[PDB]
Write a protein that binds this ligand. Sequence first.
Ligand code: CHL
Ligand code: CHL
Ligand code: CHL
Ligand code: CLA
Ligand code: DGA
Ligand code: LUT
Ligand code: LUT
Ligand code: LUT
Lengths: 221, 35, 222, 50, 222, 44, 243
Amino acid sequence: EFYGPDRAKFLGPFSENDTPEYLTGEFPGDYGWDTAGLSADPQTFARYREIELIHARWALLGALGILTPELLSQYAGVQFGEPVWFKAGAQIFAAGGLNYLGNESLIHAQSIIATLAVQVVLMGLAEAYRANGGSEGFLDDLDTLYPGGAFDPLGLADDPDTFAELKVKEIKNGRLAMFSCLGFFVQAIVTGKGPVQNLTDHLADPTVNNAFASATKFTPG
Amino acid sequence: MLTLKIFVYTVVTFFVGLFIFGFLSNDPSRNPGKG
Amino acid sequence: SAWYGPDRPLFLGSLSGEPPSYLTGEFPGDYGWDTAGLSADPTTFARYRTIELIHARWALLGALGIITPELLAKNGVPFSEDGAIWFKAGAEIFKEGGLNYLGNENLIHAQSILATLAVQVIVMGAAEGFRANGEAPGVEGLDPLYPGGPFDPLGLADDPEAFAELKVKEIKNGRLAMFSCLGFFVQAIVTGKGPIQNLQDHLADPGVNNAFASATKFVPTP
Amino acid sequence: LVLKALYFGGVYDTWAPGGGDVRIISNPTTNAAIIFGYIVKSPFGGDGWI
Amino acid sequence: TINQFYGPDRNKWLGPYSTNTPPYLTGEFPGDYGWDTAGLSADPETFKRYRELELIHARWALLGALGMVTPELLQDDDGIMFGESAIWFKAGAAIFQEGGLNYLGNPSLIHAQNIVATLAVQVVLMGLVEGYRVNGGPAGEGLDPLYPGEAFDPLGLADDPEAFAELKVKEIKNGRLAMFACLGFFVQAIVTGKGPIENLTDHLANPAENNAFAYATKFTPQ
Amino acid sequence: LVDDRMNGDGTGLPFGVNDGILGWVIAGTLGTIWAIYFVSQKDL
Amino acid sequence: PDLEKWYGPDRKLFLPGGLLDRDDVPEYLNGELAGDYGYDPLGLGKDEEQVEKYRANELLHARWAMLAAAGIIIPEGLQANGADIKGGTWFETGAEMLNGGTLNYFAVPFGVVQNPLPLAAVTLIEIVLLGAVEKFRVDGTGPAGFSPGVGKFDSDIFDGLDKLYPGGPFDPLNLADDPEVFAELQVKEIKNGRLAMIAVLAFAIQSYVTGEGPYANITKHLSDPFGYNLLTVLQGDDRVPTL
Ligand code: CHL
Ligand code: CHL
Ligand code: CHL
Ligand code: CLA
Ligand SMILES: CCCCCCCCCCCCCCCCCC(=O)OC[C@H](CO)OC(=O)CCCCCCCCCCCCCCCCC
Ligand SMILES: CC1=C[C@H](O)CC(C)(C)[C@H]1/C=C/C(C)=C/C=C/C(C)=C/C=C/C=C(C)/C=C/C=C(C)/C=C/C1=C(C)C[C@H](O)CC1(C)C
Ligand SMILES: CC1=C[C@H](O)CC(C)(C)[C@H]1/C=C/C(C)=C/C=C/C(C)=C/C=C/C=C(C)/C=C/C=C(C)/C=C/C1=C(C)C[C@H](O)CC1(C)C
Ligand SMILES: CC1=C[C@H](O)CC(C)(C)[C@H]1/C=C/C(C)=C/C=C/C(C)=C/C=C/C=C(C)/C=C/C=C(C)/C=C/C1=C(C)C[C@H](O)CC1(C)C
């Protein structure tokens, strides 16, 4: 499963005969999908693999992070400046500023330019250390895509077997998170309500409350 | 009358189309001579 | 008129210049237009040629299906208010009368958008999984891009020169239909009326009723 | 002839009021339907072709 | 010297924190700071096509940025030299005025009203021009596709290749700065509705409040 | 009115078509003749 | 190409074949100069020395009259459509700065700037400038350089040059190194020059007759073709109609 000539495919029994010859299943999450064929070049394919990998991870952060404020508004009545994620940024433009869980003394941020500057410099230095692969001996090694050293404290990187299926789990969970992220993004522009709010309004009546109910919203005049 | 008009119209445009495409169908090659 | 080989016509005519080396001229519609170098290698060229021709057939069907119902609406086929205008046709399924083919209540008369999409998913998924794989219960070895066989009932694709000429007609008609489908998409958004309605407005007063009247309508205003 | 009717004195109109006169043509009918409906018209009474 | 811009010893798109840059970027082209993480130019002739795109876009965007700013710099205090069209993203409607599109406030300059005629003249002239660029014509037939330099360099300039190369680095860096700016002009126009000069003057009035931060709540869904 | 008529006289009626089905069948019949003529080419 | 239509024995003459046998041309015009139509009813050419000596003056007259044609037609039209020229009409432009009334120069598109220097300064620098240029032309001696075609040339380039066609410094854009295209452009130049000479003499006699500029002449003629022409202007006032 998930490796070798009998790996899983992106069309199952429909991807038996016509598959690209460059997609041999050496990599995790390989299913053979290059119908548009953007990776007939090997090093270009390597660069897209790097893109896909950290893209999946960033999508995982986003997918978990834009459910938690709305889920916490649900159930145990957690208060915010504003719970829904696509209108979360305006939290910093409120009178009380930005507060982590509604407490005036949690972060109480009001300087949006300053927090932009801080985030830009910190994440820039982090990404610059990532792409360079270390310097002057300070982490001046590793493959820059599956580091492990100084980034895997639980040590779940040994057992090459478990590493292989765990890598497949990583890329596959990430792809699920990217699919969900497009769900969040398109529900944001179409419904204008939170993902959890749309799922709550979805459980009442799926027959009339589907995506076709707002299919006439963007009708040109 | 409208049914008769549609019938005569399709008959006339059929025969006139036959005439048009018959004379388009390489008519100066129907001679029995040389040239 | 020499649609194949190096002496084929190119996409700029007398000012074309030297075509790319991979676009030698053995495939239909080769006008030597690859200015972004997408198809330098054979595999991207083959995949992009498949995307081309599949999109071409989809656009020929699409252009005819956008043109037809609103023409028949002007002919007396009774589509009420939105079955005529193509981008509003999908909204017709929600009305109290359902979706009636040719406006007659006995035809189709659909009410379940979920059911029609689900039947379409299983039918088109089977069809496209069969198209990609190249195998089906009844056909074994066929060209993935130009299948034929049961797809050529009339025997029109037999002799190679007529086959190749019809391939050129196919690819050029498909590109024209793709161009017109892009046209339908854009004139839908900016004008809000049907394509033949745009044509008849342009047929009344072409000097004012054109695309230049709808240029100032998208200025972002403070 | 178009230039003569538009900017070079106009042409004689019998349909202008007062017995008709020489008038300058302003806004000619460039509508293709009006132009070619004469051509496609029947030659008989009431229509007279062109 | 010139070694700063060519060879492996050149400057980089991430500076001293960039060793893992791509090995097909040897340092033989203008610019080339090593930024190809998407890897799109690993293919050699697609890389060539992409450089042609880069330099053509660079020249067009230098002209575009300096032209989107220059009417709004030449606008006067009472606003009678140009009407409302001094702002670049409302320039086209200047040809729809009763006084037409006049190059400056004097009606003796251009004074154009037929947008169809202007569009057709532009299409024909630009078609011949770019056909000469792709194939060859009066200005050259076998010159360099990107740096012809026989009628396009009449003031000498391109001698002594040591200076010629670093001047080309100036070309591509000025061009890339210009296209970054033009992207700025587009995204500023779509979210403000104000001219770029008045964006600059409003920011120079109050930089804490007059920024895109104030306009981040503009596109919110209901 | 005492009896039903087309009243198609005058009116500058193009090709004498008062209903669109007349133009459609004219175009269609010329098209069928053109179709047989076109497919029956590369002959003689 | 197609240089066998202006040179050689077969060339376009000042009359076509039926009205002019090729043996009727003077023997000294057999296709050696640009713009040789064999036009000589009055024997002013004599032989090749006098023909090329008169061609010197023809070429200078051409290169003056072409710029002249542009300079008469352009500012009058600019003023007529609304430029701030104040004196575009050519036969009264000199009358502007008789009382110190210096002209307004149009550096189109960024112009309408006042010229802050009077008639005496204009004429003093005009003689000291073009007299210097014309003394240079007969001597072939030029002090300094910095031309776009060849940059910062020294004075040892005007000697050895062809008189009346000094390429190099006077050829910034080149486009004449091929003798074929150089000959074609020589024919183009001399024919444009003769056309402009006819045009400027027409400007002069049109101004003397109609009392106005040639752009006004062409504009009023395009407005009323039959109502404004030579036979209209020499009428004086109306015409008794024949009814
Ligand atoms: C020493 C550290 C160093 C670092 C960290 C960088 C980093 C960078 N350089 Mg630099 N450089 C560095 C040194 C040097 N550079 C250059 C010369 C250049 C050039 C010439 C160029 C760069 C470019 C870039 C960028 C390439 C990566 C990118 O596009 O990321 C993407 C960036 C992000 C994802 C950050 C996003 C931040 C986020 C807060 C933005 C705001 C978000 C909004 C609020 C919301 C937007 C979305 C909404 C609407 C839904 C990047 C920001 C290139 C570039 O991109 O230029 C524009 C480029 O062309 N560098 C030189 C001189 C030789 C350097 C010398 O040391
Ligand atoms: C790069 C070229 C180019 C661009 C960017 C524009 C942009 C514009 N023109 Mg112009 N035009 C251009 C070329 C030409 N126009 C005209 C003639 C006119 C007229 C007559 C009018 C305009 C108007 C307009 C504006 C429409 C209002 C609006 O907000 O629209 C949407 C645009 C934006 C929100 C700005 C951001 C643009 C960005 C989203 C798109 C950039 C990518 C492009 C799709 C690239 C296309 C490439 C081409 C080669 C296919 C707009 C900003 C109108 C105007 O000013 O009304 C007040 C108008 O009346 N144009 C001609 C013929 C001479 C052109 C020839 O090249
Ligand atoms: C991936 C990052 C990211 C995304 C997707 C968003 C998305 C959003 N932010 Mg934002 N932000 C992001 C990063 C950041 N924001 C801010 C600071 C703010 C503020 C202060 C505000 C926003 C607001 C907004 C919203 C814009 C208003 C609107 O309705 O627009 C249209 C929205 C859509 C069309 C739907 C969502 C957009 C999505 C589909 C586009 C994604 C594009 C890119 C792929 C994302 C990455 C770009 C760069 C960083 C690489 C929007 C939903 C505003 C808001 O919520 O106001 C109510 C607001 O006031 N952001 C910072 C600085 C701390 C960021 C990063 O550093
Ligand atoms: C349809 C008319 C027509 C055509 C096709 C020709 C063609 C030809 N003529 Mg010719 N000619 C014509 C009418 C015509 N002619 C008339 C009316 C006259 C009397 C003036 C002449 C007198 C004439 C002579 C004396 C000679 C020729 C000669 C020739 C031959 C080549 C040289 C040449 O261009 O002649 C030159 C003709 C002219 C310079 C006349 C001026 C033409 C300009 C361009 C007028 C622009 C036309 C404009 C639209 C006005 C038309 C208005 C219209 C509504 C009435 C050539 C094959 C030569 C020959 O026989 O070779 C051996 C020759 O010697 N022609
Ligand atoms: C009220 C409406 C009736 C008005 C009648 C006039 C309608 C407009 C037609 C004008 C076309 C001009 C024909 C000139 C060339 C004909 C010579 C030819 O034939 O040359 C033949 C040549 C041979 O190779 O082929 C070719 O050049 C290709 C032939 C080009 C012709 C295009 C025909 C348009 C579509 C035809 C009918 C649509 C068919 C539908 C019916 C079919 C069955 C349902
Ligand atoms: C494979 C293939 C093959 C063939 O042949 C070709 C083709 C077709 C091309 C292909 C495909 C592709 C694809 C599918 C793609 C897609 C992607 C995606 C979906 C992404 C997303 C992705 C997504 C993502 C990242 C996301 C992310 C997110 C984030 C960051 C977020 C953030 C946030 C948060 C938390 C919080 C706040 O309050 C809000 C915000 C700020 C908002
Ligand atoms: C070649 C080249 C080269 C260079 O160098 C580069 C480049 C630029 C890349 C290039 C180019 C490209 C291009 C041109 C592209 C385009 C495309 C298109 C347009 C498509 C469309 C395409 C289009 C299409 C498919 C379309 C389709 C359609 C359809 C299905 C439709 C459907 C329908 C109908 C019927 C009706 C109804 O009521 C509705 C609906 C249901 C909706
Ligand atoms: C390198 C790399 C690598 C990695 O890995 C990946 C990636 C990311 C892909 C990359 C990047 C890329 C980029 C950055 C891009 C960008 C571009 C641009 C921005 C362009 C523009 C560009 C731009 C341009 C051309 C522009 C142009 C302009 C124009 C014409 C304008 C015109 C005008 C004017 C004057 C004014 C008036 O009033 C209006 C008009 C008339 C309209």
